[PDB]
From a paper:
To explore the structural basis of this binding enhancement, we performed cryo-EM studies of the complex formed between XBB.1.5 and hACE2. We observed a 3D class of this complex with full occupancy of hACE2 on the trimer, achieving a global reconstruction of this complex at 2.5 Å resolution using C3 symmetry. This is in contrast with our studies of previous SARS-CoV-2 variants, finding only one or two RBDs bound with varying density strengths corresponding to hACE2 (with samples prepared at identical spike:hACE2 molar ratios), and is consistent with the premise of enhanced hACE2 binding by the XBB.1.5 spike protein. Consistent with previous reports, we observed potent (nanomolar) binding of the XBB.1.5 RBD to hACE2.
Residue numbers in the entry:
A (entry chain A): 14 to 23, 27 to 71, 78 to 143, 153 to 178, 187 to 249, 256 to 301
B (entry chain C): 302 to 620, 641 to 675, 691 to 696
C (entry chain F): 321 to 421
């Protein structure tokens, strides 16, 4: 039941100092720690995607590179998860992350994904994929898309483990990527062990009951992580409150 | 230390005191999400050997002890691994294959065997890594009129490959003429019934068999047997093993408020200084056990053979005992009088022989 | 070999009573499916002892050939089956065997 319904436009914005996450699960208090990891560089070019469905294939699959920074200002019900893999068909394994109002299901199977996958609302996954065979992983837990509010995620695929980091922020009367530091916290480490080179965002569409689906829009920001050395400031309570990118400018390099 | 039989008056550093570890603690996370072994070795209904049931086991803790204590077993033969090491090993996937056969055929569920069951119903490879478990099931699978719901494949064109299943009911064509679907001369239905009755001989009574096959792949192994989590002991020098992080030190109470996602703690110089207990969400200050430089304060051997021992940096309660800022001095008596320095101790304290006295 | 568990559990080695009637002829039964039984209204006599040895010789003969296919589960001729029980009846009646037990 694969149907093409979403069109997508793209613009370019500045990352500012968004995208910092905790590189490990180690408590450090009132220290300066220099770590080399896959980080989103400061003031980097981030692509802002607007996906519009009004009531042709114009929603291509994005590359994954070395990791993806995802942000959204939308409500928790419009964006409902993501798709990860290489070929996105029945010949290779793929990872499907689907959130709903009660829980999140993370599942790795051989999905035959649609070109324009979307969850239609009960909820049906027949517009996301046509078949799912040889399924090798399932993980159900509490959801990480809950309820103006900026939602930030960091996805990494390192040595068999898919790491997801998340943070929510009460933004207000400012550009969607605000100033200041909001360190993302480790949310899940998934023992997946698959090759991921491409990814795609999942949206939810409502049936119209009157142009089969209700018209809608979703805006999200995508940035790409790079191997970078960061210097993180840990305060008295162990929270990362500040960071300097070691290779951004000579002042920060001197600080590093 | 000085490689001489006569020691001149002074203080000499001779050894290093250490507090030996007394106990070992291996506290690990509260065991939960136990693999469903209570649903494979204890089902209300088993399967025929031709359509043998396979359950994949992943992302859980493998508590094989219930399997061990789940019935008296006619055979617990393990091919490739020893029955004990299982729990301390971690495999990627565990396949549990369940079926019912007759006692005489239990020997056929093994690598390198032949028969009706091995060739046409269930075949194990010659490099099989796993265990075979069988037990008697007269009270559950035998009826007096005859239990005709357990079937086996008697006729097949070719032998089965390892870990293969055939569910076909195709009429076995043993002759030259086509069968045409209808049973008739030289055309036999391949699935025959195991007519179990309670009065059969031991070799023919129904036996339930579960075959556990362990496989490792390139993926991270997520079926890791439960690691014993011993009780927690505080305020002593104990070898600690917390979530795979090992060391040796005292575990004192901590005032540090960790964030919910953090598990370990590190110093400015990247040395562990704190940890979170995985059984009870409390924070402990890991502090290494006391060590000190044992220094010996002695006058000349010409005058006397009395010695005093200074444990540098060690409080006196953790080893004529006097406490100094330099450390604990044993064998010298503090005198409130002040004299010139004869043997330097440190922090304003000096020692002399008059017995050996220590003074400011 | 020893005697099976089902032999001890299922055989009726004593006359059951007046209310339940049974054939009193000594007979060894090879039910099959590993089931071997003796129908014998045993009493206490030297005779019934020798006859019990005879019928257990019959049952041992039936047990040895059980592995064979169904239509060959018999004696090689009609004489062997009773001979292998009568040799036990011969050996058990000797003065040496009676002094041994
Ligand atoms: C939200 O997602 C959860 C998990 O996918 C759904 O809960 C499952 O519902 C199915 C019904 O087909 C049951 O078989 C499962 O046992 C349920 N799983 C759990 C963990 O509860 C739930 O129905 C979804 N809700 C909506 C509104 O779509
Ligand atoms: C972001 O990338 C686009 C095309 O890749 C480029 O035209 C644009 O100038 C970039 N933004 C900045 C701030 O350089
Ligand atoms: C994947 O599925 C197909 C049929 O569903 C099967 O032939 C193939 O062997 C399966 N591969 C694995 C690795 O399970
Ligand atoms: C991952 O997939 C891409 C695209 O198919 C392929 O080019 C690459 O070699 C793969 N990497 C590995 C390690 O298999
Ligand atoms: C740290 O914790 C203390 C005690 O709970 C709290 O008063 C303080 O606001 C927290 N934050 C900082 C930045 O000190
Ligand atoms: C195992 O089987 C016995 C059989 O009656 C039953 O009493 C018991 O509850 C079962 N245990 C489990 C854990 O299923
Ligand atoms: C660990 O198990 C014990 C025993 O049931 C329980 O009291 C304790 O609260 C558990 N801890 C956690 C973090 O669940
Ligand atoms: C069965 O025979 C063996 C010797 O082969 C003997 O040791 C054993 O006790 C016998 N069984 C019984 C129940 O007497």
């Amino acid at each position: 039941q694969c149907v093409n319904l979403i069109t997508r436009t793209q613009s370019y914005t500045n990352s500012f100092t968004r995208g910092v996450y905790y590189p490990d699960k180690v408590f450090r208090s009132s220290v300066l720690h220099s770590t080399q990891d896959l980080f989103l560089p400061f003031f980097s070019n981030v692509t802002w995607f607007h996906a519009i469905h009004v009531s042709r294939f114009d929603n291509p699959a994005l590359p994954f590179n070395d990791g993806v920074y995802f942000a959204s200002t939308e409500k928790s019900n419009i964006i409902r998860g993501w798709i990860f893999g290489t070929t996105l068909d029945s010949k290779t394994q793929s990872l499907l992350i689907v959130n709903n109002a009660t829980n999140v299901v993370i599942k790795v199977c051989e999905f035959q994904f649609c070109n324009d996958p979307f969850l239609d609302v009960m909820e049906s996954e027949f517009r996301v994929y046509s078949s799912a065979n040889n399924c090798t992983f399932e993980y159900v837990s509490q959801p990480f898309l809950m309820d103006k509010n900026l939602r930030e995620f960091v996805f990494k695929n390192i040595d068999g483990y898919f790491k997801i980091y998340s943070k929510h922020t009460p933004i207000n009367l400012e550009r969607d990527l605000p100033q200041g530091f909001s360190a993302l916290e480790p949310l899940v480490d998934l023992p997946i062990g698959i090759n991921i080179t491409r990814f795609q965002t999942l949206l939810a569409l409502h049936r119209s009951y009157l142009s089969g689906w209700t018209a809608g829009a979703a805006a999200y920001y995508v940035g790409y992580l790079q191997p970078r050395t960061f210097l993180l400031k840990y305060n008295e309570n162990g929270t990362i409150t500040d960071a300097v990118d070691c290779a951004l400018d000579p002042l920060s390099e001197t600080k590093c | 230390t000085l490689k001489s039989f006569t020691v001149e008056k002074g203080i000499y550093q001779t050894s290093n005191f250490r507090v030996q570890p007394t106990e070992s603690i291996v506290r690990f996370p509260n065991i939960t999400n136990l693999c469903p072994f209570h649903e494979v070795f204890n089902a209300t209904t088993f399967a025929s050997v031709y359509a043998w049931n396979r359950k994949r086991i992943s992302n859980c803790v493998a508590d094989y002890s219930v399997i061990y204590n789940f019935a008296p077993f006619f055979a617990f033969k393990c091919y490739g691994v020893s029955p004990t090491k299982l729990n301390d090993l971690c495999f990627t996937n565990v396949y549990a294959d369940s079926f019912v056969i007759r006692g005489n055929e239990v020997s056929q569920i093994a690598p390198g065997q032949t028969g009706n069951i091995a060739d046409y119903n269930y075949k194990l490879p010659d490099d099989f890594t796993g265990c075979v478990i069988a037990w008697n099931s007269n009270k559950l699978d035998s009826k007096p009129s005859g239990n005709y719901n357990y079937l086996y494949r008697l006729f097949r064109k070719s032998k089965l490959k390892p870990f293969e299943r055939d569910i076909s009911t195709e009429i076995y064509q043993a002759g030259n003429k086509p069968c045409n679907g209808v049973a008739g001369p030289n055309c036999y239905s391949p699935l025959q019934s195991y007519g179990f009755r309670p009065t059969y001989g031991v070799g023919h009574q129904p036996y339930r068999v579960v075959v556990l096959s362990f496989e490792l792949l390139h993926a991270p192994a997520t079926v890791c047997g439960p690691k014993k989590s011993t009780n927690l002991v505080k305020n002593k020098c104990v070898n600690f093993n917390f979530n795979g992080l090992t060391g040796t030190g005292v575990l004192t109470e901590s005032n540090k408020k960790f964030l919910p996602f953090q598990q370990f703690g590190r110093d400015i110089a990247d040395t562990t200084d704190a940890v979170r207990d995985p059984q009870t969400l409390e924070i402990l200050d890991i502090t290494p056990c006391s060590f000190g430089g044992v220094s010996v304060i002695t006058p000349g051997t010409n005058t006397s053979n009395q010695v005093a021992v200074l444990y540098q940096g060690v409080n006196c309660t953790e080893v004529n005992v006097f406490q100094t800022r330099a450390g604990c001095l044993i064998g010298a008596e503090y005198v409130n009088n002040s004299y010139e320095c004869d043997i330097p101790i440190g922090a304003g304290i000096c020692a002399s022989y008059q017995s050996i006295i220590a003074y400011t | 070999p020893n005697m099976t568990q089902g032999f001890w559990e299922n055989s009726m080695l004593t006359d059951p009573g007046n209310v339940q009637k049974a054939v009193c002829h000594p007979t060894a039964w090879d039910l099959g499916k590993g089931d071997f039984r003796i129908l014998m209204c045993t009493k206490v006599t030297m005779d019934d002892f020798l006859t019990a040895h005879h019928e257990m010789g019959h049952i041992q003969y039936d047990m040895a050939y059980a592995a064979q296919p169904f239509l060959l589960r018999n004696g090689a001729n009609e004489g062997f089956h009773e001979a292998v029980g009568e040799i036990m009846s011969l050996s058990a009646a000797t003065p040496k065997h009676l002094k041994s037990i």
